[PDB]
């Protein structure tokens, strides 16, 4: 299945889904038996976040309308509430003293990964380094339940926008959908907004220039999220940034969210990364471990600045994997060649085209183990000449740097842009030093003796401070 098919299918599923704040005492079967009267239920689950919440995915969207019909406005807060009716519900018993079935406990689907301290033991008790990186991956990656919750959050924000742009969509991009998302990560959202003798037309208010329109639209949705709600808080409008942005927390799901107007270049990146992530499990294994490594050594940071970003790091990892013998993943120009007329995408002059079908890509013949790749990553970039060379992911080669920035990574979809232009000399040097130390640790450590000594080894040794 292609990225685009997965997006559509996930959004269509979210479109016919709701959230129900459950009561203290909860009989799952009765609730589901009741909710099913409004229509068939394809999927559901429960999770914990300031109480027990449940996601309900109906087979028909009409089921949502049916359920909405019988739902009421909090009688306890009559004229004291903003009567905006969304898909967030709060179920309570009609006759509290008529609970007629055995109350069982419910299975709570986890929405956050276990912390680093708890992860180290599990890594240390693994057999090899490969397995360590697969433990980490499995502990960290997004669950099916979490993904559905992310798409639903998008779907609730969409409903606000459509009020006046009926054909709009709010689509997740970035780590949420590029296969490299870890539990607890932000949800990045793109708003995408576009016979007689008389020529008949609607009267419609015109919009200003692209940027100014984006700012007003995002400002108003921000205001709505803040005031029409429910569950949105810490709504922070950052409309003056290069890319206008609204940040907000969504309390029912517990996500932190970023909303901007659609940038089709950024979506192609997400699809590019999706392909790379789907082509081979080692790709995702390496990313998750190296992201974690960077965070632990203070190379990355939650606030923008001179630090390397996960996006940049992720791109450096793809470049590494492009330069193997033989390559674990193909280059972008190779994917452009395989791209037929169905997959052609030009976005402001530059050809952002590449294949969508995974079948067309021949599998790699590379059989290197993660053990070798992790150390070689550190080895490779530890001894990389960042002053003379830059990273081109189209060619998959080291080339001369168009600009004199310390760390230059060629933006694969735009001609002379550097995705890591923010990075200064100090931060790059610290990365190189951490990379070199990490390689040294791995190359010349006694793995067996450290297991005996009950001390860190392999991935675990590079995931603790120096």
Ligand X SMILES: Nc1nc2c(ncn2[C@@H]2O[C@H](COP(=O)(O)OP(=O)(O)OP(=O)(O)O)[C@@H](O)[C@H]2O)c(=O)[nH]1
CA distance linking residue 456 with residue 21, whole number of Å:
43
| Positions in the binding site for ligand X (CB under 6 A) | 174-175, 185-186, 188, 266, 269-270, 310-311, 411, 419
Binding mask 347-386 vs a second copy (x if CB under 8 A, - otherwise)? Answer: ----------------------------------------
Q: Which is nearer to ligand X, 270 or 289 (CB)?
A: 270
Answer for which of 174, 254, 412, 456 binds Mg ion (CB under 5 A) is 174
- 433: partner contacted, choices Mg ion, ligand X, a second copy, none (Cβ within 5-8 A by kind): none
Q: What's the closest the beta carbon of residue 98 comes to a second copy, in angstroms?
A: 8
From first CA to last CA, the distance across the chain in angstroms is: 43
Q: Which two tokens stand for residue 139?
A: 């502990």
Q: Which is nearer to Mg ion, 144 or 429 (CB)?
A: 144
185 lies in the binding site for Mg ion (CB under 5 A): yes
Asked whether the CA dihedral 124, 130, 131, 135 is positive or negative, the reply is: positive
Give CA 85 to chain center in angstroms. 28
Answer for which of 51, 74, 305, 426 binds a second copy (CB under 8 A) is 74
Q: What count of other Cβ atoms lies within 10 Å of the Cβ of residue 1? A: 10
Q: How far is CA 169 from CA 108, 281, 459, in A?
A: 30, 31, 41
Supply angle C-alpha 180, 318, 112, rounded to 5.
15
CA distance linking residue 325 with residue 285, whole number of Å:
19
Q: Which two tokens stand for residue 17?
A: 């889904």
Q: How far is CA 365 from CA 43, 357, 368, in A?
A: 39, 19, 9
Supply angle C-alpha 258, 260, 263, rounded to 5.
125
CA distance linking residue 9 with residue 3, whole number of Å:
10
Say whether 411 counts as a known binding-site residue.
no
Q: What's the closest the beta carbon of residue 186 comes to ligand X, in angstroms?
A: 5
Q: How far is CA 341 from CA 5, 273, 356, 357, in A?
A: 17, 21, 11, 13
Q: Are 138 and 182 in contact (CB under 8 A)?
A: no
Binding mask 78-97 vs a second copy (x if CB under 8 A, - otherwise)? Answer: -xxxxxxxx-xxxxxxxx--
Q: Are 247 and 260 in contact (CB under 8 A)?
A: no
Q: What's the closest the beta carbon of residue 139 comes to ligand X, in angstroms?
A: 16
- 206: partner contacted, choices ligand X, Mg ion, a second copy, none (Cβ within 5-8 A by kind): a second copy
Say whether 311 counts as a known binding-site residue.
yes
CA distance linking residue 174 with residue 243, whole number of Å:
15
159 lies in the binding site for Mg ion (CB under 5 A): no
Angle between helices 370-382 and 129-140 (to 10 degrees): 90
Q: Which is nearer to a second copy, 92 or 400 (CB)?
A: 92
CA distance linking residue 75 with residue 227, whole number of Å:
20
CA distance linking residue 5 with residue 23, whole number of Å:
36
Say whether 357 counts as a known binding-site residue.
no
Say whether 49 counts as a known binding-site residue.
no
Answer for which of 41, 186, 230, 358 binds a second copy (CB under 8 A) is 230
Give the binding-site size for Mg ion (rule: CB under 5 A). 5
Candidate segments 55-63, 186-194, 223-231, 401-409, binder of Mg ion by CB under 5 A: 186-194
Sheet harboring 52-58: ordered strands across?
17-21, 52-58, 41-48
175 lies in the binding site for Mg ion (CB under 5 A): yes
Candidate segments 188-196, 217-225, 292-300, 440-448, binder of Mg ion by CB under 5 A: 188-196
Say whether 376 counts as a known binding-site residue.
no
Q: Is the peptide bond before 230 cis (omega within 30 degrees of 0)?
A: yes
Q: What's the closest the beta carbon of residue 370 comes to a second copy, in angstroms?
A: 44
- 419: partner contacted, choices a second copy, Mg ion, ligand X, none (Cβ within 5-8 A by kind): ligand X
Say whether 186 counts as a known binding-site residue.
yes
Nearest to 360 by CA among 347, 343, 348, 373: 343
Q: Which is nearer to ligand X, 419 or 435 (CB)?
A: 419
Q: Which is nearer to Mg ion, 188 or 271 (CB)?
A: 188
Q: What's the closest the beta carbon of residue 85 comes to a second copy, in angstroms?
A: 6
240 lies in the binding site for a second copy (CB under 8 A): no
Q: Strand, helix or coil at 427?
A: helix
Q: Which is nearer to Mg ion, 313 or 442 (CB)?
A: 313
Say whether 188 counts as a known binding-site residue.
yes
CA distance linking residue 317 with residue 97, whole number of Å:
60
73 lies in the binding site for a second copy (CB under 8 A): yes
Q: Which residues bind a second copy (CB under 8 A)?
A: 21, 23, 30-31, 34, 37, 67, 70-75, 77, 79-86, 88-95, 98, 160, 163-167, 193-210, 213, 216-217, 219-220, 223-224, 227-232, 252
Which residue numbers belong to the known binding site? 175, 178, 186, 188, 266, 269, 291, 310-311
Binding-site annotation, residues for CTP: 175, 266, 310-311
Point out the annotated binding site for GTP. 175, 291, 310
Site of interaction with Mg ion (CB under 5 A): 174-175, 185-186, 188
Binding residues for Mg(2+): 175, 186, 188
């Amino acid at each position: 299945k292609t990225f685009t098919e997965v997006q559509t299918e996930r959004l269509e599923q979210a479109d016919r889904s709701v959230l129900i704040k459950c009561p203290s005492k909860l009989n799952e079967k009765k609730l589901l038996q009741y909710l099913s009267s409004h229509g068939k239920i394809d999927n559901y689950f429960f999770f914990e976040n300031r109480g027990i919440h449940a996601l309900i995915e109906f087979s028909e969207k009409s089921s949502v309308a049916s359920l909405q019909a019988v739902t009421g406005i909090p009688k306890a807060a009559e004229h004291h509430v903003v009567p905006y009716k969304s898909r967030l519900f709060t179920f309570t018993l009609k006759n509290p003293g008529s609970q007629a079935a055995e109350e069982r406990p419910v299975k709570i689907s986890p929405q956050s990964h276990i912390p680093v301290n708890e992860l180290i033991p599990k890594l240390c008790h693994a057999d090899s380094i490969s397995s360590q990186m697969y433990i980490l991956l499995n502990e960290y990656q997004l669950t099916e339940e979490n993904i559905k919750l992310r798409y639903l959050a998008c779907s609730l924000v969409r409903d606000f926008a459509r009020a006046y742009f009926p054909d709009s969509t709010v689509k997740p991009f970035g780590s949420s959908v590029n296969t490299f998302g870890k539990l607890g990560c932000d949800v990045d959202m793109f708003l995408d907004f576009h016979k007689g003798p008389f020529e008949m037309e609607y009267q419609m208010k015109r919009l200003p220039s692209e940027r100014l329109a984006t700012q007003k639209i995002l400002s108003i949705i921000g205001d709505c999220l803040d005031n029409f709600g429910p569950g949105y808080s810490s709504v922070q409008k950052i409309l003056n940034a290069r890319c206008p942005l609204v940040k907000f927390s969504h309390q029912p799901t517990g996500f932190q969210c970023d909303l901007s107007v659609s940038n089709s270049i950024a979506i192609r990146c997400s699809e590019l990364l999706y392909i790379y992530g789907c082509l081979d499990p080692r790709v995702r294994a390496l990313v998750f471990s190296l992201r974690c490594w960077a965070r632990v050594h203070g190379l990355t940071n939650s606030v923008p600045g001179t630090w390397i970003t996960n996006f940049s790091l992720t791109m450096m990892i793809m470049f590494f994997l492009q330069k193997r013998s033989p390559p674990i993943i193909p280059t972008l120009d190779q994917l452009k060649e395989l791209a037929d007329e169905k997959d052609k995408h030009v976005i402001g002059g530059y050809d952002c085209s590449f294949v969508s079908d995974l079948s067309k890509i021949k599998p790699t013949k590379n059989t290197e183990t993660l053990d070798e790749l992790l150390c070689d990553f550190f080895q490779y970039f530890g001894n990389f000449d960042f002053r003379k060379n830059s990273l081109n992911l189209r060619k998959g080669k080291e080339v001369n740097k168009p600009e004199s920035s310390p760390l230059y990574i060629w933006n694969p979809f735009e001609q002379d842009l550097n995705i890591s232009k923010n990075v200064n000399q100090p931060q790059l040097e610290k990365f190189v030093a951490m990379a070199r130390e990490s390689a040294w640790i791995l190359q010349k450590e006694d793995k067996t003796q450290q297991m005996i000594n009950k001390e860190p080894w392999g991935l675990a040794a590079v995931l603790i401070p120096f």
